Each structure stands twice: as structure tokens, then as C-alpha cells.
Amino acid sequence: FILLKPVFHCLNEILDLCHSFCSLVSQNLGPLDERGAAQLSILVKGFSRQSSLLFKILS
Amino acid sequence: LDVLNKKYSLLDHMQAMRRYLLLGQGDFIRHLMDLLKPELVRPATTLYQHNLTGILETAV
Amino acid sequence: REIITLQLGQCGNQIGFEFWKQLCAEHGISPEGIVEEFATDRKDVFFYQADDEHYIPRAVLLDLEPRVIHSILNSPYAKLYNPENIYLGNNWASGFSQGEKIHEDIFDIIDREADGSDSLEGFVLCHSIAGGTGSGLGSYLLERLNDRYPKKLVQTYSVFPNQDEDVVVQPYNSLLTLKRLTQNADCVVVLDNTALNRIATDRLHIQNPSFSQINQLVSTIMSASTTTLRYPGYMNNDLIGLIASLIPTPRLHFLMTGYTPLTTDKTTVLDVMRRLLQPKNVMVSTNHCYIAILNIIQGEVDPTQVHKSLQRIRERKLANFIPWGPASIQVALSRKSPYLPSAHRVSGLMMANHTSISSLFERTCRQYDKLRKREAFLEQFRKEDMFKDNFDEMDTSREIVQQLIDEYHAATRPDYISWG
Amino acid sequence: REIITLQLGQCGNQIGFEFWKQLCAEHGISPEGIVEEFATDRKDVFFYQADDEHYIPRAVLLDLEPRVIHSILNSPYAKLYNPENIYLGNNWASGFSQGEKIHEDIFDIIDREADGSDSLEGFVLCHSIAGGTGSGLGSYLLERLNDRYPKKLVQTYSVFPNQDEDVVVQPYNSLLTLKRLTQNADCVVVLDNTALNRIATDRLHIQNPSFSQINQLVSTIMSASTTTLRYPGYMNNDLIGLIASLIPTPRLHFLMTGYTPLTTDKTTVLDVMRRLLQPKNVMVSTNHCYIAILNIIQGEVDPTQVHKSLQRIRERKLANFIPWGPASIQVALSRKSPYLPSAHRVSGLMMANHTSISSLFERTCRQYDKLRKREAFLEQFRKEDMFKDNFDEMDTSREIVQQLIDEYHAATRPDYISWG
């Protein structure tokens, strides 16, 4: 799916979301809020949003 | 006729359009319908081809 | 799906071994168990199938006081079978208590094989009615398996003892086994000793190796009756769809058999069917009428001629029953067996529900009542005392078969909407 | 990267020497250490690599009261290994204090080899649970290495003692070692004595050289479990990526093993996988269900057939867990080993997180509690007094394994969002 498709952009978006997620959890180390909750909430919503996109073609 | 019945199996298609489409096989299709009961009895808006293609592979 | 075979009693283990050798010869295997490279065949219903080219037959080798079973055990076929279920008087209560004490360990063996199996449709019993050591024990284990699996079917292939009476305890044993056969069993294939005896004395003039030829005849029957199950069928290739039509009510579930080649020591379906309605083709010997009739034909056949055939049987009116309800003679077809030469390439079988067997029941009902009036034939030992001190199970048995005779007679009448 | 092997205890040093000889035979070397000119191979992960054609195996030879280790020492392979880490009762506290006094000099030896090494991923312990002289000492040194390197992983290969109980102090020793195994160790490969014993008595009728054959079996397992690390892998060729999926929570980190050839005294991936889900392939003997399952296959294979295979396992539903969460059975592949002939060219292994081991834990939880009620089985000597005067470490151990059993039971339930 390296061929130009909507799925190809979608996987690129998956990767950028994951990369920002790694970037966030790096400095947090152990669970204690450093005001990380806002960005974390955006990310956990984004995962659900993109998870819905694989349900677009479910046949 | 000769190259068609050997190179594309024109006869085997006729063997399998009564056996399979028309339940002339009998066993395999009942076994299919037997696996297909709990899925099909559900309202079909919550079912999709990915489970059927999964249980089809599977008897066959 | 798959069906587990259970064998018990002396005659039952004999015909089971005969049936297994019959199917080893019928299918592409050698007597080592090793699958043969010489081959419509399925061996997955009665033989535990591995990759391993030794398809172990699903037969539970259970018996009481084994004597023929040892001679079965040392055989040039005994490399094909070894499922490890082998275990070590002629009264009903004695055999009943003897099966009663060991039922848990043999049921653990049953549970082992049921755990190894994935699917199950029925348990088929090799059995002899009032066989002495087999009976009592066989009825108790029947009660155990009927109790323990309520979602499953039970079938028996059992011969009814008929020597035209002398066993003084045979009406008691066969009577108690029959009560368990109606209320703890739901599919009964009934056969008579004397009809097969008369057919054997018709074809030959032997009396001594009679059990051998009877084994062969009944083995042909159990192969034919199961052929549509073992060979790839699409119309009642399940037991339940087969005996659905013949059982209109769960008290009346009894079958007699037919078979066209009888005494050989056009061939059209019209002719074999007109043959099969004759009572000399029936293996069980005031008009008593059928309730429902099913038949199977195995051969190399047309379908317009079966239409003319069953039309001919219709206009012949050579099957004159009048039960109460709109049933049929049911024509069904199975594959004729390849891989072995067989005579009578067109061969038919019938299973029906017939009220004539009530007369046979009434024979025992007479005989036991006479012996109950005399009371010297129960033999009255400690096994009989510990089984039932009052022998009120005899009275419960008697009233059960009494209700069965009433159900027979009401079923023959055009009113079976009328209950007692 | 590279992983340093540590070996301790009598059984542990035995299987370590067996593993090293297994890899000398597996790779292109001679028993002098001299590299062979006869050769997918890497020898850089477990052997200190020089130019010098003597690749010194990275094994720390530490032990308490050595007796088998001397017989290991004089060997026709002892020219291949000499890393100079050799050092000279059967209770937990005695061995614990004995390791406690000498921990600094042996840790200086560890620091020497860690200084010589450039990269490090883990420390793998050859260990025996409640092995007497090995236990106590092994738990203390485990605590030291776990304290001293917090950025590194710790794995153990240890056998759980199961002789179906008679050692009166074995629940205490194995219990205390288990508490250190959960809270000072993070990767535990669990194996049972009795399952390997039953497999060995299945293939042969021996009882005396049992440790030899058990050594061979477990050696095959530790080679297979590390093959994707030693042979050039690209999918979890690190330990952490391997056991990431099987550890959902850092309290539940326990693995049982599987292996398809068991008793030998199509071959498709469908068939070896359907084999491997059977509990007779598992080396550890109310339904307890898996949390997550990983498997590796080594052979000469397709990829459409593994798609059909794991699809078949799916439609079979022969792995019926229901933990709480959307995990998988994880199929992974490693290189089948060249340079030596091996039977079963298609060979599979599985590591999963299973709650059945809680039952085994509860056995000890029963046994120790009974002995704690009797109090004649702690043996109560000066080592036990100086280790803990109140024996409140026993209570801390008990409440830790108690919380572990609660974590097991909550993990099996569809609610593990519900904490205690």
C-alpha cells in the first residue's frame, strides 16, 4: 500500500500521531502529571478517530 | 472444444455449478449452513463479508 | 457428524468385530491398520482418524465375564484396533449389579474417548436382548449414558431372542431390558433369531455354524443401514433425520428391517420394492398395520422409473395400513458401495414402524405372567434380592409394557387423538 | 545487542555446560576453542569474540559448595572456556547469608566482565528453584544485580520443583525465591520437573539417568528460545521486544514453554500449531485462560499457508481465553539452524502468559501454610535466626504472593480495570 491511496496518507498520519506520542512519553518517565493531560487527551481521542477510519471499508 | 475442456476445465465448471451453486454436493453446503447459523440469525447490518470469507476458507 | 460405536455382550462383540472387518475390507485399508493405496468413501465417522495411517476404530470393548472376546483379541486384525477399553451370571439382576459397581471407571473411559472426539451424533450399541451376561449390565450402562448426555441420540442394534418356547429366566431378562429400551433408549432396531434361523435353514442345511452366517447377514444389514451415513449423503445422512419419520411419538420408536436377497444357496426398482413389501423379506415374523414406512435403495438407477415404481406400489395397494394420519412410504437413495464386488447391484432395505411386534411382546406378556403365577422362574437369588426385595420393578416394568401395548393398539386405530 | 550469561546452582551449571557444548557443536568451532573451517550464524552474543580463535564463552562460574562443578571443570572442552570467575547448606537463609558475605568480590568479577563488554541487553540466569545451595545465594545476587543495573533486563531459566509431595523445607525456599523472582526479576521462564519426568518416562523406561535427558530437553528449549536472537533476526531479536507482548503488567510476567517433538523413543504449520495448543505439548501441567500467547516457528516454510494456519486456529477456537483485551496469538519465525542435522525440520515453540500456574502457586500456598501451622519445617537454625529473627519476611513473602494470586484472578476476569 505504498501505492498512492487514501490508506497511504492514513498510515502516514498514524505514524505522525505515534511519533508525537513517543515524544510525549519520553520526558514523563513515571506517571505523575506534569500538565501532560491535555496533549494526552488529544492523542487518545485521535487514536479512536483514526481507528474509526479502518471501519470505512469493512466488507 | 479439446483445448477448452483441458486448459480452462470447461467440464469441471459444469460439475461444480450444480454441485456447489445448486447444493448437488450436499455435504459441504450443509456443513456450511451449519457453521453459518449463529452469524446469519443476527440482524445482518452488524455482519460483514470478512467473517464469511473467514468461515468459508475453513470448511472448504 | 460423527457417531461413537459401543459394543457389549457376546453376540454384540462378535457382530462388532465382523462389522469392523467388513469395513476394513470395504475401505482402503489393510489388517495392520495401514491405509491402502488401492482406492464415495468416508472413514471419519466410525474410525478415529489421524495422519498416522492407523485409523483406530471407535469401539468400546466392554463385556462381562469374557470368553469369546479373548478369541477375538488374538487375531490377524488386532494390529488395526487397540483403543484400550478392555475390561474383565446369566441373570438380569446379577449382570445389572456387576455393571453397577464398575460403571464409574468405564464411564471415565467413555469420557476419555468423548473428550478426544470433537463432534457426536449418537451412541450405537452392539447388544443382545436377554443375552445373560450382556443384559442387566448393558441396561444399566445404557441408563448411565442416557442420563449423562441428554442432548444426544441413542441407537441400539439388538436381536430379540426367539427360539419358539428352554430358558426359564429369559422373559424376565428380556422384559426388564425392554423396559429400559423404551424409557432409557429412543432408537431400537429389532431383529428376530428365528426368522434369520429359518432363512439360514432355507439357503443351507446347517445348524452348527449358524451364528457365523447370522453374523454375516446382520453385518450386511448394519452396513446398509449406515451406508448413507458413511457414504456421502445429503438426505437424512443424520440418524435423527432418518428415524424422524418412523417415530411419530417417543413411545413408539421400533423398526423392523427388510432385505431383498434372502436365500441364494427385470431388476428394476418396481420389482425390488414389490419384493420388499412381502413379509418373507421382513426379518421379524385382527390385522396389524404400519404407522410409517421408510426405505433406502442402493444401486445404479433412473428417476422416472422410481416415479412409476412408487406409483405402481400405490395402485397395487399391497401395503394396506390405516393408522390415522397422512404419512407415506418414503423412498430414499444411498450410494452403492465401490471397492468390493457385491451381488444384487440393486439392493433395497426398509425400516418401518409396525404394530405386529406388539404380538411378539404379548408372547412375553403371556409367558412371564404364567411364570409369575408359578414363581419358580425368577430363580430368586441374592442378586435378585439386593436388586429389588419386593420385585416391584417387575410390576413397574409390566405396567410400562402394558401402556406400550395400549399405545400400539390406539396407534393402529384411526383415533390416536384419544388418550387413555 | 549482546547478552551476558550467568550460571549458578548445580542443575544450572549442568545445563549451562550442556548448552555451551550444544552451541560449540552447533557453530563452527572445535572443543579447543579453535574456530573451525567447516562453515546464518552469529557467535558474538554469548561468546567473547577476539581475533584470537578462542571465543571465550560469557558464563560466570559461580556456585556454593561445588561438587558437580569439579567434574565439569576437568573436561575435554575445558580448553575452550576459561574466563576466571570460579569460586568456592541446603536452606534458603544459609545460602543467602553465604552469598551475602562474598557478594562484593564476585560483583567485582561481574564488573570486570561488564567493563570488557561494550553493549548489554540482559543477564540470563541458569538457576534451580529451591535447589538448596543455589537458592538463597542466587536470590541475593539477583537482588544485587537488579539493584546495580536499573537500565537492564533480567531473565531467568529456572525449573520449578515438582515431585508431587519429601523435602520439608522446599516450600519455604521456593516461596522466598519466588518473592525475589517477582519483585527483583522481570522475565521468568517456568518449567516443571514432573512434566519432563513424565515425558522422559514416556519415551524411555529409565529413572536413573533422568537428569541427563532432562538436561538435553531443556537445552534444546533454551537454544530454540534464543535462536532468533543468536541467528540473524529482525522481529524481536531483542529480549524486550519478545516478552513485551507476553507481559501486560509488570507483576504478571511468567512464561510456559511448548515444543512439538515430545516422545519419539502433513508436516504443515497448521498441523504443528494445532499440535502446540494441546496441553501435552506444554511443559507445565474453574477454567484458567491465557492472557497473551506468542509462538515461534523454525523451518522451511510458505506464507500463504501460515495465513490459512492461523485462520484455521481462529475458526477452530481451540484456544479459548477471554482475558479482557484485544491481544492475539502471535506468530513469529526464526531461522532453522544449519551446520547440524536435526529431526523435525519444522519445529515450533510457544511462550505465553497463562493463569494455570496460579494453581501451582496455590499448591505451595497450601503446603507452606500447613507447615506454618505446624512449625517443624522451617528447621529453625542460626542462619534462619540471623536472616530474620521474627520470620516476618515469610509474612511479607506470603502477602506478596497473595497479591499475585489476586492479580492472576483479576487478570482472568473481563475486568482488570478494577483494582483491589
Query: What would the 3-class secondary structure string for C153-208 be?
Result: EEEEEEEECCCCCCCCCHHHHHHHHHHHHHHCCCEEEEEEHHHHHHHHHHHCCCCC
Which residues of chain B does D304 touch, with a Cβ-Cβ cutoff of 8 Å? none
Shortest CA gap B9–chain A (Å): 30
Residues in B touching A59 (Cβ below 8 Å) = 48-50
Q: Which chains touch B (3 or more CB pairs under 8 A)?
A: A, C, D
Q: Which residues of C are annotated as a binding site?
A: 130-136
| B vs A contact (3+ beta-carbon pairs below 8 A) | yes
- Residues D308, B57: C-beta atoms closer than 8 Å: yes
- How far does chain C reach from its first CA to its final CA, in angstroms? 39
B54 and D315 in contact (C-beta within 8 Å)? Answer: yes
Neighbours of C413 (CB within 10 A): 12
Secondary structure of residue D312 in the 3-state scheme? helix
Angle between helices B27-35 and B49-59 (to 10 degrees): 140
B34 touches chain D (CB under 8 A): no
In sequence order, the 6+-apart residues with CB closer than 8 A to the CB of C216 are C18
Distance from the Cα of B32 to chain C's closest Cα (Å) equals 13
Work out the minimum CA distance from B58 to partner chain D, whole angstroms. 6
Q: Is the dihedral angle over the CA atoms A11, A17, A19, A22 positive or is it negative?
A: negative
Sign of CA dihedral D164, D168, D172, D177: negative
Which grid cell is C209?
455354524
Whether chain B has a CB inside 8 Å of the CB on A58: the answer is yes
**Chain A nearest CA to B52, separation (Å):** 10
Nearest to D158 by CA among D186, D184, D130, D120: D130
Report the DSSP beta bridge partners of residue D156: D125, D188
CA end-to-end span of chain A, whole Å?
Answer: 18
For residue C237, which residues of chain B lie inside 8 Å, CB to CB?
A: 26-27
Q: How far is B4 from chain A (nearest CA, A)?
A: 34
B30 Cα to chain C: minimum distance (Å): 8
Nearest to D318 by CA among D371, D256, D275: D275
CA B54 to chain A, closest CA, distance in angstroms equals 12
The alpha carbon dihedral of C180, C184, C185, C186 has a sign of: positive
Q: What is the CA radius of gyration of chain C?
A: 21
8 Å CB contact between C272 and C321:
no
Taking CB atoms and an 8 Å cut-off, how many pairs form between chains B and D?
Answer: 10
Distance CA D400, CA D394 (A): 10
Closest-CA residue of chain C to B24 = C234
- Please list every residue in chain B whose beta carbon sits closer than 8 Å to the beta carbon of residue D314: 54
| Residues of chain B contacting residue A58, judged by C-beta atoms under 8 Å apart | 48, 50
C abuts A (3+ Cβ pairs < 8 Å): no
Do B54 and D312 lie within an 8 Å CB cutoff?
A: no
Spatial CB neighbours of C283, under 8 Å, sequence gap ≥ 6: C191, C192, C195, C196, C221, C256, C257, C258, C259
Binding-site residue positions of C for GTP: 130-136
Residue D297: beta bridge partners? Answer: D333, D348
CA of D318 to nearest chain B CA: how many angstroms apart?
14
CB–CB contact B57 D314 (8 Å) = no
Query: Whole-angstrom Cα distance, residue D22 to residue D38?
Result: 17
Against chain D, the chains showing at least 3 CB pairs within 8 Å are B
A57 lies within 8 A of chain B by CB = no
Residue C376 φ/ψ, nearest 5 degrees: -140, 10
Could you list the beta-strand ranges (E) of D201-334.
Answer: 254-259, 290-298, 329-334
Q: Nearest residue on chain B to A57, judged by CA atoms? A: B48
DSSP state of C288: -
Residues in binding site of D: 130-136
Please state, in angstroms and rounded to a whole number, the distance separating the CA atoms of residues D246 and D406. 19
Residue of A nearest to B53 (CA): A59
Contact D311 B58 (CB under 8 A): yes
Among candidate residues D92, D90, D63, D124, the one with its CA nearest the CA of residue D397: D92
Closest alpha carbon within chain B to A55: B48
**Would you call B57 an interface residue with chain D, using a CB distance cutoff of 8 Å?**
yes
How many C-beta neighbours within 10 Å does residue D101 have? 9
Radius of gyration for the alpha carbons in chain B, expressed in angstroms and rounded = 15
| Alpha carbon distance D375, C229 (integer Å) | 66
- The secondary structure of chain A in percent helix, strand, coil, rounded to multiples of 5, reads 70, 0, 30
B-facing residues of A in 16-55 (CB < 8 A) are none
Inspect the interface and report whether the beta carbons of B55 and D315 lie closer than 8 Å: yes
Q: C362 and C325 in contact (C-beta within 8 Å)? A: no
Contacts of C76 (CB under 8 A, 6+ apart): C31
Angle (CA) C396 C398 C401, round 5°: 110
Cell of C121: 451424533
Q: Chain B, 5-44: which have a CB under 8 Å from a chain A CB?
A: none
Cβ burial, residue C120 (10 Å; 0-12/13-18/19+) = middle
> Measuring CA to CA, how many Å separate D33 from each of D37, D52, D78, D79?
13, 10, 9, 6
A42 Cβ contact partners less than 8 Å away, ≥ 6 residues apart: none
Sheet-wide strand order for C4-7: C59-61, C4-7, C122-128, C153-160, C187-192, C254-259, C347-354, C290-298, C329-334
**Most B-contacting residue of A54, A55, A56, A59 (CB-CB within 10 A), to test interface:** A59
| Contact with chain C for residue B30, Cβ under 8 A | yes
Which residues of A fall within a CB distance of 8 Å from B49? Answer: 59
A59 touches chain B (CB under 8 A): yes
**Count of CB atoms situated within 10 Å of the CB of C26:** 20
CA-to-CA distance for C27 and D213, rounded, in angstroms?
Answer: 42
Cα–Cα distance between D88 and D104 in angstroms, integer?
15
Contacts of B31 in chain C (CB under 8 A): none
Whole-angstrom Cα distance, residue D228 to residue D236? 8
Phi, psi of D129 (to 5 degrees): -75, 125
Contact D355, D288 (CB under 8 A): yes
User: Between helices D137-148 and D92-101, what is the axis angle to 10°?
Assistant: 50
Task: Dump the DSSP string for D47-96.
Answer: EE--SSS--EE-EEE--SS-SHHHHHHSSTTTTT---S------SHHHHH
